């Protein structure tokens, strides 16, 4: 009962954003501002987690899966720079005021040339309500997100814009995932790898990760 | 059933120390060498604790409540400073190399005078491989634990020694209960309250905790 669950969280000052049936009978997976919790249908018991499914081809972290579900929903808000012939797809939490982020963007042609598609989500290191957050809100709301990001990173000024994109979601999700600096990379399998890597190195890293992830 | 849970734990190379009931249908409270886990009766899902009962006034850590069993099993290994007119009994995870722990101990007579009995368990912040662990191992192995603890704190040379006392167990239990620093107080109901509190404040805290946890 979603209603009972929200009342309990309310009494505790905890706010939820997503509730799903858990793989465990009588329980639900609840994403909150205190992390992913596991709560019984009656809202009377909460288990910290994470929850792992140890009944299948391998140990699956349900908490990580819940967070990846949030990332999936944010695909419509990602700024995508697709490689001509896509070999790898990475999601990068970036900050327009971040030096390494400036560098990463300036080398986008190279990452793309090496078959790496880069998808951006906003992560203002200075937090919400910062100049950085305000600036990225404008970019993400532009008529052409890519051109707007390109313009700003080029030192130009983007036109103020408003839309339903909420940078707080990008920031919050990054925090929940473990982002502690920018740029931060999230691999196609869900793994978080904080830090900047040049095109050639990144390509090598991703080829190896893909091979290691596939046992090859 | 026991078999399913035992087979799952075996798959993880984990050894179960005790399978107990859980306040949630379809799962059990399992104490292992990897901490307390909640495992469904079919052994298909594992949820890291702790679990909280939030059906009442304030949240209650049911995991810590259960662990009181482990805590009481170490009763004889505790260094006890009995209050003449005992009104409250608290268990404190302390580190002889911690300044706040020294400040608390120096006022032991005051806590005792306020009706607070203090029982110590050893918690080396620096881990089992530290001077703290070696020094407290000698204290807990002394003919007179109380005098030995006082001496060490006061800067006196404690006579080296060894015994059946395993500081590792005090450390392991503390970690499980959530000890994230010293001194850390464990209430008679399992509630962990990290931090130093002067005798007067401590007494007021315990009194209010009773009322807020009771209902009068």
Curated annotation (Swiss-Prot), chains A, B:
The keyword Membrane does not apply. It is found in: Periplasm. One of its GO terms (cellular component) is periplasmic space. GO terms for molecular function: disulfide oxidoreductase activity. The keyword Nucleotide-binding does not apply. Residues 16-211 form the Thioredoxin domain. InterPro entries: DiS-bond_Isoase_DsbC/G, DiS-bond_isomerase_DsbC/G_N, DiS-bond_isomerase_DsbC/G_N_sf, Thiol:disulfide_interchange, Thioredoxin-like_fold, Thioredoxin-like_sf, Thioredoxin_CS, Thioredoxin_domain. It comes from the Bacteria. Disulfide bonds join 98-101, 141-163. Keywords: Disulfide bond, Periplasm, Redox-active center, Signal. Homodimer. Belongs to the thioredoxin family. DsbC subfamily. Required for disulfide bond formation in some periplasmic proteins. Acts by transferring its disulfide bond to other proteins and is reduced in the process. DsbC is reoxidized by a yet uncharacterized protein. Also acts as a disulfide isomerase. This is Thiol:disulfide interchange protein DsbC.
